[PDB]
Symmetry: C3
Subunit: 160 residues, 3 copies
């Protein structure tokens, strides 16, 4: 089987979340859970209908993010894949909501780092076999590094 490496565009200030789902109700459910997560979250959603007209189904409240979602979904081109781009918010704000959508099967990635999606192609179609999120590890953090990452979260206001 052939394996393609797909580069996912991630404009500055955005985060992308890519996963797998089923049933066209995926779109409205994702739209709804994201809209009720915060009044200021900006998002775009794309879902690959795997049968029938096989159309990229979409929705959201930000056209720029919607178009980015449609593009990435097309590049991947794997049936039942869904893509979400968000701005003015972070993946941790909505990751659990997404995992909890009844249509959602799994999530492949949630990141803002350079991202590649690995796609296998067969005689039937395309399927996601994984992703390359960011770079490989260079070393083990020290006590000084630990102190620094702890101060970071406290500075951002995530932890006390």
């Amino acid at each position: 089987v052939k394996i393609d490496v797909i580069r996912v565009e991630i404009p500055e200030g955005t985060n992308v979340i890519i996963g797998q789902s089923h049933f066209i109700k995926t779109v409205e459910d994702l739209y709804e859970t994201l809209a009720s997560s915060s009044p200021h979250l900006k998002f775009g959603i794309a879902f690959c209908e795997a049968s029938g007209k096989r159309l990229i189904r979409w929705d959201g409240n930000d056209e720029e993010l919607i178009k980015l979602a449609q593009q990435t979904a097309l590049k991947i081109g794997a049936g039942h894949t869904f893509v979400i781009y968000i701005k003015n918010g972070f993946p941790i704000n909505v990751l659990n909501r997404i995992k909890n959508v009844e249509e959602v099967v799994r999530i492949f990635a949630a990141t803002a780092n350079p991202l590649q999606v690995l796609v296998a192609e067969t005689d039937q179609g395309r399927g996601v076999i994984g992703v390359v999120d960011g770079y490989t590890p260079l070393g083990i953090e020290t006590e000084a590094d630990i102190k620094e990452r702890k101060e970071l979260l406290r500075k951002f206001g995530y932890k006390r």
Copy 2:
């Protein structure tokens, strides 16, 4: 590393859910959560014990669905893989219950579309690297399309 493309049989009227789990308790836990999801759901469960006797463990309340699960589990042949076939009900009815089963590690697919499971084989055994769920996208839906899918969900009573 060799890669095999496994064809999953999905008879008309049924849906298949394939994932990964651990521990023998997987079977009874899956049986229990499906049984208490509805008094009319019909289901069959297969689990690939990956050590000891390495036997396909199974249960369910429908003989034919059990056989389908057994067959598909054998064809994938990857340790700790679980397969569920359901009828007279849909994946969205039980997908969240399955995600919440303490043994379940992840889910690979939930669909009724033609499905292929991608299996990598090594010196040790077999592992699932992904699936080809349905077909590739043929375009982007229009406003007209959007209006129709909305009516679709309302006609079937999923949304108002």
Copy 3:
């Protein structure tokens, strides 16, 4: 694309849990949920920071398990991969907690069986495409086998 077969070391009496996450807060959150899951659970955590200094971030309450986690994370070498080793406890005790951590994207495996992590190589770095958990199935269990596994769970005390 090149696929590496990475052997994961699993000391006796321990279980390894490998997944994918995002954001440094992953370490603090995993540590916390494991710490508040049981007063006797022993654990080690490693997270592959995929940007900046690209350091293996870690924490835990058992130096041995921590080192194992760091080593395994390095061996896999895929950005944003997290590795957890637990002792004096079982995966079913904490698998749901891990799935519910807002940073966690997905889980690749939770087991004590011989484990191989399949890693895809690209010009950007490494990514996990799957795992080989244990061995392939040898056959289908019988009615007698079903009675035995049911009795086994009663003996352990998981079911009545």
